[PDB]
Amino acid sequence: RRYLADKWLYDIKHATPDGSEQSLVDFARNAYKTYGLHANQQTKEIVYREWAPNAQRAFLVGEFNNWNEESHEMKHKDEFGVFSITLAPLENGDFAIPHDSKIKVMFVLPDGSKVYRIPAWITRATQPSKETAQKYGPTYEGRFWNPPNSYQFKHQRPKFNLANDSIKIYEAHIGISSPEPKVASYKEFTQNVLPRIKHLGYDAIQLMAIMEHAYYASFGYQVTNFFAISSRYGTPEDLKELIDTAHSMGILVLLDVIHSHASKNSEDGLNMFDGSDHQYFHSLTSGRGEHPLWDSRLFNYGSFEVQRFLLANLAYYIDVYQFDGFRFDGVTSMLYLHHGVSGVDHEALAYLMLANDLVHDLLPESAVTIAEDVSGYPTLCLPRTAGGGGFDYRLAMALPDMWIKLLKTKQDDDWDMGHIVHTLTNRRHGEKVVAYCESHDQALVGDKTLAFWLMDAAMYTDMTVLKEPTLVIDRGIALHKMIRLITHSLGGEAYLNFEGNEFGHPEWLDFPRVGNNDSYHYARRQFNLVDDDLLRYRHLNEFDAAMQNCESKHQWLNTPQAYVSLKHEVDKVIAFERNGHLFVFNFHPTQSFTDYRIGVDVAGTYKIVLNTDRAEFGGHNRIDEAQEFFTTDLEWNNRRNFIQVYIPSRTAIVLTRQM
């Protein structure tokens, strides 16, 4: 439709001093090696460069020259609008700027006034002290990171081929990852939570809220400093070790990348960086719209230095931190000119195309990219040789709403099985999907988790092991396990789980904020319930670990769609097959079934590999897992063979073929 992607690539490849040709990787590597600030370890010189076309003069200031506005003026802009400076070593032979001290760049504007900014490619920035804040407000401060010894990676990236391998994703947030009302750290995650995720068996960790942001209750979505990992949890070397460690564990690490919008903050953010309304962002008079959920600003992808900035940002996280891939947030607001309330923004789309090219050129056959897109735009996840966007996956954001309607309005006798199957299997061919049954927003104040819809206030008295389950608690535990498993096996090409729902976390989540007196009482995760043996929460957690490890041995996610054979409206039973394996579910409120027939297409002997009625999962142990299920050579539910099962009221099972 438009050929902006190809025009922009020719200019990249002949942007050399002699006119000779270079590669796209060479462009983005030479950029993060040439822009920002860089120390020379052999001569002790330092070089700094900075794009700022609206500014007339530029001066580097900070603790290293006592914020002097005259002594370190940069050389005149070249024909591309870039200031530059070489700092000689001091007379004693030392670097002229000390390590982790505070710095700013000052610009003189056309009207002669002065503004103060954190440099745009800085690698660290920090929240102010209570004394500074009473005076100057809540603005963050930027730091010059030049340590005496940089962390040296010891492990290679894990062996991974995107086309062939499955990926199961644990969605996590560093700060809430403890039972205490506080902000937890990178090192605590490395030592206390990486083992829990390895026990549960996920392939990858999706890190939310890593790009730096000042407003905590925004869950990470309002970004201020793009080349800086967040300081409220620790330092750049702490994170490199966290990733080196996951890599030794065989775990890929992905970054939540927010390139859809930016914070409205001015001094600690990019809004009005060089004084003007039109450097990184579209001007307000351009009428190019606003984000419908977040008070924010939007980028101008057509500027050559903005392409250099965002593309170097991707190569920097891959090369310098050894991240393995990305989830792009807010894709629905980027794709459309009305930002989600059918007319497409082709400049924003061309940037995502070039971004997918670079990332796959950097790690041939291994790199991963994912999209957050409510709308479901077609061709987003097809390759570039076929005209596509180049994404590998998208999220399945409609599924959680099906379960809420069921519990609020219907008696148990009146559940509709055919409606449940249709919702889970409706996806577009060639465009792979990440599925889940409740989202990180459903866990918040004012909302209700799955667990609360099922059992209500009786969770605060009758979740004890000491008394036999009441009628309400028995019903509730069984349904919580059945809902996750049918989502995992029937609903997509990858899986996702939000921290805490793997065990039925009660009550709600709430960050510190004005309406609760900045209370951290609900800004935490009661991992301690999993560790208490007088309660039933551990029953749900042990079920989750068994689900994930089953998939890694018997692949079923990154494979073709399932064939479904049953969905009965008076008995309330569902059954299907995928990548050669078999799945069965019974939802009836009072009746248990003996000798129920189930269909199967490849003859042989089958054995159960997962079962929800285990006592260790809170069940009543009515089901015998040592049984061999031989196939009968007779057609059933449109398959070539069948087996016969016993399934009590409210239980589910999975089976595979013995070679």
Closest C-alpha among 591, 575, 579 to residue 642: 575
Give strand ranges (E) for 269-355: 325-328
What's phi and psi for 225, nearest 5 deg?
Answer: -135, 110
> What Å resolution does this PDB entry report?
2.1
Residue 239 and residue 205: Cα distance in Å, rounded? 13
Q: Of the residues 241, 329, 345, 462, which is catalytic?
A: 329
Q: Please tell me whether 67 is known to bind a ligand.
A: yes
Ranges of H-type helices in 164-235: 186-188, 194-200
The technique is X-ray
Do the Cβ atoms of 318 and 270 come closer than 8 Å? no
What residue ranges in 147-190 does DSSP mark as E strands?
A: 168-172
Q: Side chain identity at 227, as an amino acid letter?
A: F
In order, the DSSP letters of 453-468 are: HHHGGGGGTS-BSSSP
- Sheet of 114-117, strand order: 57-62, 103-108, 114-117
Distance, CA of 177 to CA of 184 (rounded, Å): 6
Runs of H (alpha helix) within 427-558: 450-455, 471-490, 527-530, 537-553
Catalytic residue among 372, 373, 438, 577: 372
Helix (H, G, I), strand (E, B) or coil at 62: strand
Contact (Cβ atoms closer than 8 angstroms) between residue 50 and residue 58: yes
Given a contact cutoff of 8 angstroms between Cβ atoms, the answer to whether 489 and 556 are in contact is yes
Q: How far is CA 323 from CA 132, 404, 578, in A?
A: 35, 36, 32
For the question of residue 633 being annotated catalytic, the response is no
User: Residue 477, exposed/middle/buried by CB under 10 A (0-12, 13-18, 19+)?
Assistant: buried
Q: Give the contacts of 450 (CB within 8 A, at least 6 positions apart).
A: 403, 437, 438, 442, 480, 483, 501, 504
How far the first Cα of the chain sits from its last, in Å, is 51
- Measured CA distances, 60 to 83, 88, 177, 406, 447 (Å): 11, 14, 39, 62, 49
Residue whose pair of structure tokens reads 């248990």 in the numeric block: 592
Name the residue among 202, 5, 19, 36 with its Cα closest to residue 118. 36
45 labelled catalytic = no
Helix or strand (DSSP H, E) at 321:
helix 304-321
Q: Is 481 annotated as a binding residue?
A: no
